[PDB]
């Protein structure tokens, strides 16, 4: 409840770690653009929701997705 | 200041058993060595039972003390069984024993 | 007298349940300090702009 609030409010936070489905489902992450996938190759359905939590309405800049 | 249990080097209480001896109407006069002697005897008996119970619980490869281990420790030991040959146990079971001719 | 006591007990239970629900809803729904510097029994050499000091023992 409050980690997402502290992410969206504070601008000095830099790195937001995540698992696959822990925060890639319905969490508003419009304050960032660059999603970086370490080993997200499990299924396209899981990854299609993964940047859906970030590339959402309210983003004010370009989104650069890096797949490693 | 400090309690009599540390004065006699024990962990069981001394004033508690002195109180329980006092109004337990066993006699109207009670000496000073009576609670420390009873305390030391209870110390040794609880320590022996806990030793055998811990050995049986470790023997089960299971990290708690379950009354099956208490039953195993009570009946495996010789004179602990002699002391406790009257008392029935709660949730303990029966030691495995088959008479020799029933094996074919 | 029993019915009024039962109604008071039901009202107290409902008030306790509502207070528990309200409490559950209201309660559930940096710069880092410097290293410690110590100097005991040690002579001090001190140097300002205009004068120098030497606090010896």
């Amino acid at each position: 409840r409050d980690l997402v609030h502290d992410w969206q409010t504070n601008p000095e936070i830099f790195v937001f770690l995540l698992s696959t489905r822990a925060g890639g489902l319905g969490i508003n992450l419009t304050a960032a653009d660059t999603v970086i996938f370490y080993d997200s190759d499990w299924n396209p359905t899981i990854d299609s929701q993964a940047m859906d939590r970030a590339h959402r309405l309210g983003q004010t800049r370009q989104v650069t997705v890096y797949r490693l | 200041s400090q309690s009599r249990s540390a004065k006699a080097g024990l962990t069981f209480p001394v004033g508690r058993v002195h109180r329980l001896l006092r109004r337990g109407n066993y006699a109207q006069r009670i000496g000073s060595g009576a609670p420390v002697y009873l305390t030391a005897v209870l110390e040794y008996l609880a320590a022996e039972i806990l030793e055998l119970a811990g050995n049986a619980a470790r023997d089960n490869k299971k990290t708690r003390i379950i009354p099956r281990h208490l039953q195993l420790a009570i009946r495996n030991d010789d004179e602990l069984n002699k002391l406790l040959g009257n008392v029935t146990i709660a949730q303990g079971g029966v030691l495995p024993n088959i008479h020799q001719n029933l094996l074919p | 007298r029993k019915n009024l006591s039962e109604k008071r007990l039901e009202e107290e239970k409902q008030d306790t349940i509502n207070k528990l629900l309200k409490k559950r809803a209201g309660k559930s729904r940096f710069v880092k300090p410097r290293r410690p510097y110590n100097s005991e029994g040690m002579t001090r050499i001190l140097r300002r702009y205009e004068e120098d000091l030497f606090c010896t023992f």
Binding site: - | T88, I89, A90, G93, I98, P104 | -
Partner: protein, 95 residues
């Protein structure tokens, strides 16, 4: 398949190997109430009192089965009979 006598040893090992209760609870509770209302009617009972009665009759019955099986081997037999039970009750002391 198994010969008659090996699976009996398997289940006797399983019954000696465990610690669960072997008497159904509700017939025992009904029996306790129906055997207590003659002494005193409209009685109330505690659940752990029923558990104490359970474990007492379990220990009494299994000890009774030890010494009646000892009566069975003493008469050069395997199956227990009623005279083995009467002998065990007499040699225990009670009537």
């Amino acid at each position: 398949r198994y010969k008659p006598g090996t699976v009996a040893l398997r289940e006797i090992r399983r019954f000696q190997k465990s610690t669960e209760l072997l008497i159904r609870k509700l017939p025992f509770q009904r029996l306790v109430r129906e055997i207590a209302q003659d002494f005193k009617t409209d009685l109330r009972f505690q659940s752990s009192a029923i558990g104490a009665l359970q474990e007492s009759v379990e220990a009494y019955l299994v000890s009774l089965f030890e010494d009646t099986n000892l009566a069975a081997i003493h008469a050069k037999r395997v199956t227990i009979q009623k005279k083995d039970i009467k002998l065990a009750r007499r040699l225990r002391g009670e009537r």
